[PDB]
Amino acid sequence: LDELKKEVSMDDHKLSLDELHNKYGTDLTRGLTNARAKEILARDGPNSLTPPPTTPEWIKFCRQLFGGFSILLWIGAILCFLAYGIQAATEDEPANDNLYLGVVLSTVVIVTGCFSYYQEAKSSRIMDSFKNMVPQQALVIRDGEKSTINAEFVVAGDLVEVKGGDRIPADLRIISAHGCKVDNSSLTGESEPQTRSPEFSSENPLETRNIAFFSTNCVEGTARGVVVYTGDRTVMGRIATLASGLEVGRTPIAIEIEHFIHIITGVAVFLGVSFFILSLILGYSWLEAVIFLIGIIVANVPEGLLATVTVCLTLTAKRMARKNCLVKNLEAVETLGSTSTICSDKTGTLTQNRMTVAHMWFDNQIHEADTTENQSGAAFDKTSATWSALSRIAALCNRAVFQAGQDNVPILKRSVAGDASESALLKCIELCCGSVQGMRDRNPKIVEIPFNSTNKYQLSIHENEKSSESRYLLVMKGAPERILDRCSTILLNGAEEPLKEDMKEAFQNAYLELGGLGERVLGFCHFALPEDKYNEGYPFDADEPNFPTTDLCFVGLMAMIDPPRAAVPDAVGKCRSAGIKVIMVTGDHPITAKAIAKGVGIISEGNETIEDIAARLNIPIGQVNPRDAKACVVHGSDLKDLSTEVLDDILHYHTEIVFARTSPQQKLIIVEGCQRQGAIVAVTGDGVNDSPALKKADIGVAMGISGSDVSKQAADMILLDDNFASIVTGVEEGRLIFDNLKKSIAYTLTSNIPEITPFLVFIIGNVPLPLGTVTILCIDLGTDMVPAISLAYEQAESDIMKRQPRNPKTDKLVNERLISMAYGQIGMIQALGGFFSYFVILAENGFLPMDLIGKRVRWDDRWISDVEDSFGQQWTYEQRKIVEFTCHTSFFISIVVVQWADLIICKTRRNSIFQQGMKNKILIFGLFEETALAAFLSYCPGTDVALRMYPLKPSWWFCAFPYSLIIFLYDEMRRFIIRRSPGGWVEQETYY
Amino acid sequence: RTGSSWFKIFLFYLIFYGCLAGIFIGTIQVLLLTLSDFEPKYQDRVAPPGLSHAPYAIKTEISFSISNPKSYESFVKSMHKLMDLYNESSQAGNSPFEDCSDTPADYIKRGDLDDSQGQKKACRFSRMWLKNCGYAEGKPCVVAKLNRIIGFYPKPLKNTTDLPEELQANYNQYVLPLRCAAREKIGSIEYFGLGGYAGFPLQYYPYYGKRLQKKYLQPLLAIQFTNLTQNMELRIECKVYGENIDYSEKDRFRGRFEVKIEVKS
Amino acid sequence: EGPDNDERFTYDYYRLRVVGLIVAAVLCVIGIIILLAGK
């Protein structure tokens, strides 16, 4: 469906103005007829974007109500009402058991539904942001007259007019223009104004001057044009549809959840029906056969687990909110940890998005300035008298000014009225020479010649601030070579000197080096005009050369670039140390893209492209073995004629990849290419041209300050302070939460065994029921909750940023090793500790373990109010039941006591508690509150009716203590083996 | 689903579960080692004695038809089961039985809950003390019973103040009374027991337990309802009175009966 | 005692409940203290 939109567009900028009118039945001068425009409206439809059909929240909520655990809990809830119905008909049961348990279980499903619904959130308003880029109104020429109309009423063929400050209402063929410049950052991510004129200037319509696009704005001048595309058919309207239309897809974390749901659901249905038939064979009435099944359901399903996961995710997202990293989708909290490839935009993401002075060439020396936002570098020069001469030209031969009321904000961050290069120079001098306004007050400008297309230079004449002179100084800047052809002397370390071929060659060298760094280079020179030849009232003519512009003194060079953000180089290296592959994907030109790649460490030192090898060896590129080149730089124009299989080979064959001059669909294609190889991919960006890629990414991260509204709609995560170091933190947090989820899951599952085994022995042994159904829910929904959550606050056991990204195909959240430990080893020890306390309670009340076998028949018989114990005493029905429920209560408390040790062992997968310590305060809180809850549930009056919880005698609490301790020792010995031999036996069997 | 590794994981879980079973058993050993053979550690959960009868009630109810044979043959099965134990052939010789007062007497202490003596000798009880009661084919002859509790001394109420069966045949010193009731007085209560009294003779106490007193016999109290009514559910409650006797709204068998007789004939 | 051994069939479930609830409360307070050591 969207495969059409993933392709590069076709256009009609090649046609003549006249020819273009024939195609759209239009007038170049009079414009369309009121009737013809209305006709075309009904024909083509409105100049608007329609949002894609969404899935209502209704269906979204209910889709969770049927996912493995909820299905089993539904079967339980209904099976409760089943047994209740069968009762209400047969023998009038005045009880509330099956009825209430059926109500409780149905509530558990609904509430669990809210948790998973909260986790599976999708806040997407892509198409809405795009719609915000179409103006409310447009100016059209109809019947030879200009009028404002609803922009939706704009059709292909009419004559539109735009001017500085307004949004392009539709894709236009420029037919007339006067000084028109446009901001195409929507399509390129670059905000430098692009001229628009009627002349065709490139085969590529996205590069030609005679096309203006919807989603962009006119920055200055005026233009008229013929509408060629409207609504969904515009270049960026298609990007809108592509972006808004892209299928979301399941996250890595989501896939893991479903996976263990299958496992646990599997064992649940297995043991469920495996013992349902095992009971009927033993001659159990279907009346009972279902009651046992309900218990089996409740025992096997970890009722509180899915909600635990959600809370652990939420708590991890809260910590990241506190580092200026907003998470829109709870699952995106983990994806960053599983990320193996980052596709990053350059401008406004890796870079500050601001022309900044990078180097200066004066005194036959290359000086480097500090490009960082917060200025974390050092000085270059202050002493040289040459510097002050260059500094003066940079301030004086400059027409840029700071906007009013910025004195509060830092120099480099403040808004400037002017072109990017003049702003850069302004901020450079203001920083290291103080107020520039002061320099422009001490040296009043009397005449100037602003930068001309033809002159290729800008000159200014000022009254020298010096009192002993107060004469006229000439300054000029422009193209380095043009400035050179106008110089005779060079200000070396203070004093001038003739411009010999020697210094002239050093100039060329300096010029070539700076240009090689991808930096824009300017020349600077001045000339102190002779006093006798220029009186204090001498008039200077700016129109006609009234003053010399030759034999001037060359002062120096200055170079500039849109520099990396301070934290970016280090963040890139850190991603790469964690084994994450970092690719650059930018709409910017290749020379600039490549230079920043080396600056931030995308391309490491020494690595070459095929073009680099060819130039170094002075040989044809076809003569170069492409396998000798680990780095590559792909232009979008070449990308366009490559198949995906060939794109896949590029991705496979290079470690250091730069995709430059890419369109928005091309970014999507590169992302998909990476994913196709089985990689989890993150995208980082800030422009509307990142929207499709951000949507398709497993996780999209947008910049918060510099980011466009669209990009932040398309993302899963926002960096609110533009701190790229947050990606590094995000991946670290993502890995940590993945491990801690394992700990929390194992902990929760472990207590399933002591809830399952009592029901089994109840059938096979014919003893009184050791633990009840209600009692199970008091564990999974009550006591285990806070402890399970607390594992989310566990510190790393080792340097997680030192390991490679997990293999999502092999490294699962819940594997066989977890089940073996939780179900086969620790849970089994917990089961016994439960049974022990059960036998203790009964034996101390007169029913010794031996006489318990095959007694349930008489025990449950409501009409036998005289059962004989081991000592020959006789018990009524309600009397023995009180002891039985007291058994449920102590078995319950036994679970809590054995979960104490389990909580401590689940703390660490490898390390010892004596190494990791007990610095998790939430965990300790869990221990205290868990025990408080259990005690309250046993001793609070009335709980014997609502939950069948009975007061325990002090000695009862200590039954499971020896089992709780064996768990601690056992797991500590086991992990001691793991560490002592990384070999594999204990490791490959039990290492979560 | 591994390789030959299936063996190594079998060798593990075999030894592992073996140890766990051996430990579980060990903790059961020590538990038993802390317990007496003659007396349970706790008795507060049987404390107030329950009162149970022979007619096995479907739901605290015994409804049947006099004009039908197999209508009551179900209740006669359980009635027989109990009384078959009070046979004279079961109580033979001076061991381990003893002839006790044919009239309600005081308690009898055979020492402590020790094995320092043989089987503590229990009082004989003749089912022949149960006058009038196949059993009552019309108007049932229910048999009451006080639940056995080791070392329990059932203490009758003293005639200090007012009483339900106000002072009639009040053998204050040696009888634990049992008065059945329904207002709703559409019946005819008739009690049979030891010495002809409507109670339990205190000479059968305290019970020394199964280990120290096997073949022991607890006193019975036969109750006959020769009601002149027919074809209606009659809620009859038999209540025992005493210092150590109490009741509960939950446990409807805590020192009392709940019988729903209906001679639907 | 002899016939006056009523205490054998008695248990102070009332005190046990009072003590149990005291303990539960204090464990609840202790937990808050440790948690609130930083929020």
Ligand SMILES: *[C@@H]1O[C@H](CO)[C@@H](O[C@H]2O[C@H](CO)[C@@H](O)[C@H](O)[C@H]2NC(C)=O)[C@H](O)[C@H]1NC(C)=O
């Ligand atoms: C318990 O007592 C009854 C009543 O005596 C015994 O019943 C048998 O003996 C009666 C004469 O004493 C006969 O009239 C009955 O037909 C006969 N009934 C049965 C069911 O056998 C009964 O056998 C005695 N049981 C024991 C075990 O001693």
Ligand SMILES: CC(C)CCC[C@@H](C)[C@H]1CC[C@H]2[C@@H]3CC=C4C[C@@H](O)CC[C@]4(C)[C@H]3CC[C@]12C
């Ligand atoms: C109540 C009692 C009788 C039930 C005992 C169940 C035992 C036999 C179960 C419980 C957990 C189970 C193990 C759980 C995990 C694994 C790892 C997997 O890669 C192979 C099977 C294996 C090794 C299972 C074998 C059987 C097992 C040990």
Ligand SMILES: *[C@@H]1O[C@H](CO)[C@@H](O)[C@H](O)[C@H]1NC(C)=O
């Ligand atoms: C009980 O049986 C005796 C004979 O043993 C008889 O005289 C008497 O009438 C019976 N009593 C009743 C109330 O039927």
Ligand SMILES: [K+]
């Ligand atoms: K469970």
Ligand SMILES: [K+]
């Ligand atoms: K995404």
Ligand SMILES: [K+]
């Ligand atoms: K559980």
Ligand SMILES: [Mg+2]
């Ligand atoms: Mg950008």
